[PDB]
Amino acid sequence: VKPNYALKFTLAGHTKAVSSVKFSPNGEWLASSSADKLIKIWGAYDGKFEKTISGHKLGISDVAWSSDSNLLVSASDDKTLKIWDVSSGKCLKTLKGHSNYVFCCNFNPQSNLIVSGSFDESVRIWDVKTGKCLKTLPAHSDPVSAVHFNRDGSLIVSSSYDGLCRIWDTASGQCLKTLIDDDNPPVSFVKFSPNGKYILAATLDNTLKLWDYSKGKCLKTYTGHKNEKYCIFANFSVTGGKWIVSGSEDNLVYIWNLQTKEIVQKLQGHTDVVISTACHPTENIIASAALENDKTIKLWKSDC
């Protein structure tokens, strides 16, 4: 089995670099954030432009959906996160506390908490209802590139340019694990596997690694792409074959067989760095997005 992802839609509208794309958990929508200070909403299946959500004062590095698909959270260079009601476009809360660019964010599965990571080297945990910061974790000694909750929300994983991935207990704020990788190259992205047993980490030595984070063992290594400068999203694709999906600094989307580590497809079409990819929750659809010289988002579909 290889997949046969083919380009179906190209989504144009952002006027600066796209930073993040994410499918809604209900599969209906794609949300995009950009250096143009905007969030856009698009139809997940047809790429149809839906609406623009605005209000940040500087560029946005990340956006993320609540579990019920009703809210977004965005992370901005203006040092804030904003919580958005997607249907009305309202800014429900502005989360203030970080002392530098907010880079990454996510809801927990219950979606009563938001985790954020910042250039201020901290990870912050927030109450969605009140907008109050509940915990500030002294997480890293360099900017925080990613933060993600596990499947039951009891753990947080963070990555940083300091070369570390750390595992945090959500309830206590305690650091439970530090993962150490030879020569400590900057970690540019991390997330949990859908089942929560592993983490997938990207490092700025053109490498993705799948870790058993409890045992602290590297189980798989994926290479062949280019990633030495930018924080590029990576994904588990689970709707068809079991793949790993990433952007790349050679303007391609890469797809690997998870088990064998072989490159099974490379998707051509973008004209600048592919900074973000996302995988649709029930259908074999990949969304990708590119930097300043391209500015477009692409929807690719496969039969497996």
Ligand X SMILES: C/N=C(/NC)NCCC[C@H](N)C(=O)O
Which range in 13-21, 23-31, 50-58, 81-89 contacts ligand X by CB under 6 A? 13-21
Which range in 15-23, 87-95, 192-200, 211-219 contacts ligand X by CB under 6 A? 15-23
Q: How far is the CB of 118 from ligand X (least distance, A)?
A: 11
The yes or no reply on residue 19 touching ligand X (CB under 6 A) is yes
CA distance 39 to 21: 10
- Segment 209 to 238, residues that bind ligand X, using CB under 6 A: 230-233
The yes or no reply on residue 150 touching ligand X (CB under 6 A) is no
Which residues in 14-46 are b (16+ Cβ under 10 Å) and which e?
beebbbbbbbbbeeebbbbbbbbbbbbbbebbe
Nearest residue (CB) to ligand X, 236 versus 302: 236
Q: Per the structure block, which two tokens stand in for 96? A: 């203030």
The yes or no reply on residue 146 touching ligand X (CB under 6 A) is yes
Burial of 200 (0-12, 13-18, 19+ CB in 10 A): buried
Using an 8 Å Cβ cutoff, are 33 and 20 in contact?
yes
Q: How far is the CB of 36 from ligand X (least distance, A)?
A: 12
Q: How far is the CB of 249 from ligand X (least distance, A)?
A: 10
Q: How far is the CB of 35 from ligand X (least distance, A)?
A: 6
36, 62, 162, 249: which one binds ligand X (CB under 6 A): 62
Give the binding-site size for ligand X (rule: CB under 6 A): 15
Show the binding pattern over residues 91-120: x = contacts ligand X (CB under 6 A), - = does not: ------------xx----------------
Helices (H) and strands (E) in the chain, counts: 0, 28
Using an 8 Å Cβ cutoff, are 225 and 264 in contact?
no
Nearest residue (CB) to ligand X, 191 versus 280: 191
- Segment 259 to 278, residues that bind ligand X, using CB under 6 A: 275
Across-strand partners of 42? 30, 49
CA distance 5 to 121: 38
Alpha-carbon distance values, 26 to 44, 62, 69 (Å): 10, 19, 6
Q: What is the binding site for ligand X (CB under 6 A)?
A: 17, 19-20, 61-62, 103-104, 145-146, 189, 230-233, 275
